[PDB]
Symmetry: C5
Subunit: 361 residues, 5 copies
Amino acid sequence: MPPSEFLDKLMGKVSGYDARIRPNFKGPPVNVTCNIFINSFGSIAETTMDYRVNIFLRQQWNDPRLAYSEYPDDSLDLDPSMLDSIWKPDLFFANEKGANFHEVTTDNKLLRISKNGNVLYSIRITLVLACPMDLKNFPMDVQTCIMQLESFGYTMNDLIFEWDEKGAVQVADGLTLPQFILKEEKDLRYCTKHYNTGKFTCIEARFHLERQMGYYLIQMYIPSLLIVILSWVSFWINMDAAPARVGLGITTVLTMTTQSSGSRASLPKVSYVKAIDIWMAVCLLFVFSALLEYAAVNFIARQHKELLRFKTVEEMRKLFISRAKRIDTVSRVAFPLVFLIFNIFYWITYKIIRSEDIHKQ
Amino acid sequence: MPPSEFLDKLMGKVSGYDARIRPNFKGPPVNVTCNIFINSFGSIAETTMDYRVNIFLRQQWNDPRLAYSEYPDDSLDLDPSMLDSIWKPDLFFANEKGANFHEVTTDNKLLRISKNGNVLYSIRITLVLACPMDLKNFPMDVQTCIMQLESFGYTMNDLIFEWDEKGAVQVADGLTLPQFILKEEKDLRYCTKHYNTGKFTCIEARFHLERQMGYYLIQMYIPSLLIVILSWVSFWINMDAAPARVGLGITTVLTMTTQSSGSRASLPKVSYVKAIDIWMAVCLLFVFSALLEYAAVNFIARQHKELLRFKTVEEMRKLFISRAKRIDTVSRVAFPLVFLIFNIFYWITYKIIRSEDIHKQ
Amino acid sequence: MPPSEFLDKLMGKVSGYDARIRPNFKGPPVNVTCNIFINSFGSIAETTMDYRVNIFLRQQWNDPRLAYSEYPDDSLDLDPSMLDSIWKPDLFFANEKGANFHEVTTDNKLLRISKNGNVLYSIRITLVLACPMDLKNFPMDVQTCIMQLESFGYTMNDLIFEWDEKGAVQVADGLTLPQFILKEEKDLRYCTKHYNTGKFTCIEARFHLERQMGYYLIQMYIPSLLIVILSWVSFWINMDAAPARVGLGITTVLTMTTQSSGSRASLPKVSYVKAIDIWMAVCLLFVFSALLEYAAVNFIARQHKELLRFKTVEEMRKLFISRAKRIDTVSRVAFPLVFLIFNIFYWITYKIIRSEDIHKQ
Amino acid sequence: MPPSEFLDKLMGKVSGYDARIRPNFKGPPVNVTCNIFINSFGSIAETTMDYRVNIFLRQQWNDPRLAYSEYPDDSLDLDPSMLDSIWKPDLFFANEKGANFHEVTTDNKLLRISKNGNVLYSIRITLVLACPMDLKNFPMDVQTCIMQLESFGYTMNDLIFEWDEKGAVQVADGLTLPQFILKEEKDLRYCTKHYNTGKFTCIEARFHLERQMGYYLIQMYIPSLLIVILSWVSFWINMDAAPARVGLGITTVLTMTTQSSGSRASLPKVSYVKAIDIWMAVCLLFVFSALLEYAAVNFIARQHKELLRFKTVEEMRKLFISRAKRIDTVSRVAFPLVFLIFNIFYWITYKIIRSEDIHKQ
Amino acid sequence: MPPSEFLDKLMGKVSGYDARIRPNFKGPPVNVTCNIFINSFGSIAETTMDYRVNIFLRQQWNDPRLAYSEYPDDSLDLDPSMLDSIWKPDLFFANEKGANFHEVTTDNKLLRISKNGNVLYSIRITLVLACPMDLKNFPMDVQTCIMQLESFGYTMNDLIFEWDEKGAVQVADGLTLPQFILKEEKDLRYCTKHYNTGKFTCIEARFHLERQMGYYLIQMYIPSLLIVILSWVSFWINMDAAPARVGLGITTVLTMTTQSSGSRASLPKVSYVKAIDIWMAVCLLFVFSALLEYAAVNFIARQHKELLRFKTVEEMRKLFISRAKRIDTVSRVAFPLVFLIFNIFYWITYKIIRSEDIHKQ
Ligand SMILES: CC[C@H](C)[C@H]1O[C@]2(CC[C@@H]1C)C[C@@H]1C[C@@H](C/C=C(/C)[C@@H](O[C@H]3C[C@H](OC)[C@@H](O[C@H]4C[C@H](OC)[C@@H](O)[C@H](C)O4)[C@H](C)O3)[C@@H](C)/C=C\C=C3/CO[C@@H]4[C@H](O)C(C)=C[C@@H](C(=O)O1)[C@]34O)O2
Ligand SMILES: CC[C@H](C)[C@H]1O[C@]2(CC[C@@H]1C)C[C@@H]1C[C@@H](C/C=C(/C)[C@@H](O[C@H]3C[C@H](OC)[C@@H](O[C@H]4C[C@H](OC)[C@@H](O)[C@H](C)O4)[C@H](C)O3)[C@@H](C)/C=C\C=C3/CO[C@@H]4[C@H](O)C(C)=C[C@@H](C(=O)O1)[C@]34O)O2
Ligand SMILES: CC[C@H](C)[C@H]1O[C@]2(CC[C@@H]1C)C[C@@H]1C[C@@H](C/C=C(/C)[C@@H](O[C@H]3C[C@H](OC)[C@@H](O[C@H]4C[C@H](OC)[C@@H](O)[C@H](C)O4)[C@H](C)O3)[C@@H](C)/C=C\C=C3/CO[C@@H]4[C@H](O)C(C)=C[C@@H](C(=O)O1)[C@]34O)O2
């Protein structure tokens, strides 16, 4: 039997197929079992709130008309061009942008018709999937990225989408994310879309994403610590040298302000407080408190010099000078100890909150 | 009756349909009732002055020729490919950019023909809708975003567009906007476009948008307050220490200037004064006034030292030194009280103006 | 008479039309009268030197073959799809980028054939029109934006383009430009393109654009004034306090430099001096002159202290100290008066130059 | 003779043309003479290393089959749609990106068939041409931008490309470049591409571009001069005032550093030294040398005060104080004279190197 | 024999070819030998992690049906339009974005059919190839960029891809990369993709890229050295002048911080430490240590003045003053020597690590 005649015969104008009609019309719904292979993952953007993926979508459904018995070979892979009339099931992604096809050299498609009528349809597509991301704890957090595959134009009674029994989501070996870690466990759950038109089958997969803390520690946490240490250095400088201590406190407060403003620039304009805001707030409060401490010392010395040059004035001079010296001596010890207590408290609470988020999943 | 023959018969070359002609030609106008479902809303940009939406446009019109009585089933959902010849009514969005269709896997369309000839047409489209936004009160404001659906090429006598009686605009459950709040109430009003060619039916929907004030309070209002408090701290420093007080006043004025310039960078170049401009102007006036106050104190002490080293000169020395000390003492109390009075006045007026805008709608 | 047969008959294969041929071939030129309606105007970019417009281009020409007498109704609006063969006259925009068509829901076109053979053709198109803009006076200027409609492939003897007698350019009511004001008067003038191939008809419309000065006054002119006032404040500070006065002069000069550099960033790299350059140059000269004035005062006091500690030396001490005090006293009065004279001179000259540009048009 | 029949006859299915075959097959090569008209030139980007042009490509070749004698009129301009089968010669640009066609209103093409069989083909295209640009002398330089027109799929024996005898490159009158000057003289030279497949004809045109020095003088050269003059001002300030002189030297060095870093931001990351680097290096060396000079003066005065307060100590005090005073006195004269000598040397050498580049062409 | 009839005959409807079927069906696999010519290479982006190339892909395979003996000429180059039915083998790039074709003037393709049935197919395509790049040593590193050519829809038994025996990868002469150096040696290795669908042939080429160190030395290494030298200059200034030394140390630490933050902005957010981080960390530690050294000197002098003004107090005054003077004297020598030792250690280790990376390849 010539191959050309057989392939033509399946699509044969003489034969009745009428691609527009679904298989087993006025009957039980067509069941489509689909599994995606994730070729590339990346380009996650917090500001735009979307991530880009490249996937091989594979759809398996049974068509009775396409059954053939003339050829013993059951595999019978076919040319992708003659995919015009194999009743491609309509599918679309509920949350998407873009979703272009790949036309390079030849269309990236794979049509394979089994002997019993099972059809394997494989298409390569890049998806700009948009997923909302909670930025409550910006430094360390776990983001769930969800892709929904939903039918358009065929109701649930008409068409049903089911996740593949084995290997529904497959990740390419060696695929890595620079800013994130992809969890191996995957959530395969189906939610049925309800509209005024009717109920349409939909299935969705959830990808847990864990943000690596290596960059943020170096970029943000270590510099702020340096600025706070510089403000601590200001205590050892002489109280008499007012421009040096004042300028040092001012410069550290200004540096903390510009660093805090600059860090959060590459982020969406969310209205809720973040972990990074708490850290920046406390560190900026520390440097501001150091400047206030010098202002208090200078004012006490001013009162000393006021009583000095216009009665127990000598006693008052010793008291006020001892008072200022005492504030400096207590301050140099007290400031790092309090900062250490805050640092361990903040890290412990955020680590257990991260553990709680991992507990919830 | 075979399904293929029936579907072919409706579109049947043997039968007369002639898609180019509208239903009930040389007769009463075709009435189209349309309701949109908003799948995704976001990407609002003040600078570009546009917002992006993804919608399921649904159009219902009655075609007498498409009436069928052979099949008892009235629903009879059909394949979207055979939408070439169902007389799709021309519609376009009056204010748009882009407006691409979704071609992923299969075209996102839904053709449903009822027994009486009613046609349900549902298409998914992303619209870069451009709406002018009044930025009189930039911090807190209510923006109305308007989408117009207007016929092109068919006059009002020829074709009429009407909003659906029930559920004209439907918002997807759980849809949220990071920077804005979407009001539940919606304005459905039709305005008829008039041109030299003729009058064309148009209908429009207004979406009230309320801008959340959570981010702007943290990002802009709280830092400016910190700079003003730093300028107040400058009073407690000794009058003799001229570089410290001068440098502190200069640094705060410079910081206020760069913060004010940086904040308004992500905004269109509108010529009218905004609320944020008033707040930045007053706070910068406060820090500038603090620097002028120190300049006055230093000049009074200079006149004291002028009379000191070259008659009532001793009396003049006590007067001038008391005068400078008095200006400092009055200033430390006076500056925060005046700032508090301005702050409550500004918040009260802007809150009642916001209430007035909500009153107008 | 059935409508379908009549519409088919006009385009009838049986009848001779041959769309490729122009009307009244080997005869007088086809005369096309065209008027544009400006739906949206905006997105003007100085750096890119282009502006984006959305227009309804309407072309009216007379075709004798399309005359019909069978139907009394003269209007007879038709479906836009059957525009393949109505001899669309070739038109293109001489200075353009992009120029995409709008394909949303259905093609945005309007074909209307009159009884005598007059054809009304209306298409909606967005044009990235590029117009050179003179930036001699950047702050306040009038820019003329020109759109040219020129034939391609048909010579002047073959085809002629004429502006509509009434309402050649129509602007949508309520259309506004945030950064510019659009003048009501319009220049309709035709210039004939000459090439080695031949002479091709072209027509052009000029849109005068006036740049609003509200933003630039607040953003650029008011801060520079603040920096100059700060430099004036430096005079009242004591001459003995060298770090305070020196640092203040340095900071103001640096601030003026960074403000001048930052302002002109969003501008093309033109080689000619602008009004904003003159203003920045003079204000920066003022702050630089203030720093030089303090350097002179400090040097005179230095010479006093040189003569003081190693003859009329006492006389020289009084002279030099009086000299420095005199320079400060004269300087505090002299600097704002001179700046006021410059300010009124600059505003008067630029206002009359703006008036002269309005005089020229 | 009816026009429709004649035009149809040339493309006539009855007649043999077979568009796929080239003219005079198995014979001498087809000779194509092509001239381009440059409608718009601009959008040159140093970083991306490309420039965008809009051109009217005109190709003239002789086809014997298209000869006609039935009509006396030799011009016989034709509709651009029937360009499917006039054997368009394959041409492509060797160094390109984009290269989109213009589809606005109607395709921008011009087919003109002469009586002898000469075919004139004119297409409008925008080309993102990428040309490497030597940035040895960044401030003033001459860049050559080259466009190559090369055949694809037809060997040199099969097809030959030749530049038009008269007017090969035509520039639109009044076309101007904001940042560059276009030289009138043009290089028309053909280079034959050699591949393993075979030899393919190619022709190329070189556009000399001269960069205007007006902007760079104002933006970069004048500010650096201001910073150097400010460092010179530092000498007149008293040696005793250590914070003023130190802060002034620091601020000028920092300002020079940020200006040098900021200027070269809009440039590719080339590894070779540029003229602007030499200028920034020398000016920054001048301000750094001024700060070192003050450090030397302060150290000499320190040694004076060391010998002062713990033998010829008095003699040493006069020597050291005279030494510091001498360094200041010599420095104020010496620094501008040396800078003037460098400035004239740099301008003379770069001007003669520019002249040498113009000499080479 | 007429050429048209012969070309038509090969594609002849009368003859059996059936393009959908592969050559020698139900037989040994089709063997495709492919070599790419790299026309342009560049646009490497670290942040996006992709590079753009323009290539001439050439595929050679043998088709028995296309054998011809009627014409003696074996070359017989053909028109690219009749490439619809020459059984183009499906190929796609495993890691790609974009991959557009070039449609300018005519499609850029070359079909050449040999006498024995060998088919040469050459297409020009621009590929946005994405390759992960290890940034362990950011300053100097060697990056391997890999392009994979893999079959889609034909299994390994069905179709095999092989690299050309001679000249598999050809680079255009004179092609250069501004920021990188391309190694002449190339890795041609084939890896077979394994999927659940089956095994598909793939071949890949590796391009070693060496990053030039010329720019980074000037832009980053030389400024940091300048800041460290400025901090060394701070030692020569008098210990009594507390504002000058304090301000100088603060300014250098701040400058180092902003330079370090600014440099790494154009880089991906990787979590691992880089060479540039080590260099910035050490240099910033040096400037911070200089500021701590002045704080220690000032504190020792403070203790001297504490013992001075409220027993061996005189002895303590000489000891403490000598101690501070000793710290300054030792510090001025010690700091550059230690920095020199670090500099040679860092350069030696990174150079041998670069040599080790070149050793591994
Ligand atoms: C320690 C902080 C105080 C403020 C110190 O600051 C100073 C001086 C001494 C102070 C005590 C300044 C500080 C650096 C240190 C010098 C320390 C370096 C040798 C490095 O650091 C160590 C510590 C670091 O552990 C957080 C540790 O990371 C590991 C974590 C993980 O393995 C467990 C793993 O992921 C990976 C292997 O790496 C690692 C051993 O490297 C240096 C690499 C840190 C980067 C330095 C700079 C990079 O750009 C940063 C910032 O953009 C710039 C603005 C300021 C720099 C700075 O902030 O400078 C900066 O941060 O000295
Ligand atoms: C007056 C200048 C000196 C330097 C004064 O500076 C300071 C203190 C006092 C000095 C004398 C600083 C200056 C502001 C003033 C405070 C003045 C405010 C109340 C406002 O101003 C007035 C004057 C203004 O008339 C030019 C006038 O505009 C009209 C013009 C038109 O109607 C005729 C019309 O279009 C429209 C209605 O508005 C208007 C009544 O509002 C305030 C709104 C000005 C904006 C303030 C700031 C906005 O961001 C600017 C800049 O990005 C930032 C960097 C510095 C600010 C500043 O520069 O601060 C800034 O400019 O105090
Ligand atoms: C002269 C330099 C020293 C440093 C002077 O600096 C200061 C004070 C006095 C010092 C001696 C500062 C300096 C400006 C001058 C004031 C001079 C202005 C009146 C103008 O200048 C003159 C000189 C200029 O000739 C180079 C000359 O150009 C011609 C060249 C060509 O015709 C032969 C032709 O192409 C075209 C016609 O224009 C022209 C007559 O205009 C002013 C227009 C210069 C621009 C001023 C500023 C623009 O933004 C610049 C920079 O972004 C900012 C950061 C600092 C400013 C500055 O740097 O300020 C800045 O440059 O005063």
